[PDB]
Amino acid sequence: ASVYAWNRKRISNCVADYSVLYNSASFSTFKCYGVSPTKLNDLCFTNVYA
Amino acid sequence: SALGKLQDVVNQNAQALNTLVKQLSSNFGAISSVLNDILSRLDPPEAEV
């Protein structure tokens, strides 16, 4: 969708491999705030909003 | 309260120790009061600040 009606998806109750996204070069920019991208794999969050 | 002069020094010392311990929960502008978590979820270059 467009920024007027940006889609929200809620993510919970699984195992997430952020490494495959970080290494994937297809992303033009991959920039994390308040957390370093390389330490996503060993953290645990309550829920994620995409 | 007959022995208030000796109770006061105990009270003052306990209060000072209590406030010193409770200061270990402040942020002072950081993102957390826990060293372990700002080390667990940041890298050295930005964990320094």
> What is the torsion angle, in degrees rounded to the nearest 10, for the CA atoms of residue A17, residue A18, residue A23 and residue A26?
110
Place of tokens 């308040």: A34
Which residues on chain A place their C-beta less than 8 Å from a C-beta of chain B? Answer: 34-36, 38-39, 42-43
Give the closest-approach CA distance of A19 to chain B in angstroms.
15
Specify the amino acid at residue B22. K
Residue A34: C-alpha distances to residues A3, A28, B4, B40 (Å): 23, 20, 51, 11
E strand or H helix at A10: strand A10-11
Please choose, from the candidates B42, B9, B15, B21, the residue with its C-alpha nearest in 3D space to the C-alpha of residue A40. Answer: B42
User: Rounded to whole angstroms, what are the CA distances from A9 to A49, A50, B48?
Assistant: 6, 5, 34
Across the interface, which of A34, A42, A43 has its CB nearest the CB of B31? A34
Gap between the Cα atoms of B6 and B12, Å rounded: 10
CA separation for the pair A22, B5 (Å, rounded): 65
Q: In this structure, which amino acid lies at residue B45?
A: P
Spatial distance between the Cα atoms of B41 and A23, rounded to a whole number of angstroms = 18
A43 and B46 within 8 Å at the Cβ level: the answer is no
Chain-centre distance for alpha carbon A5: 20
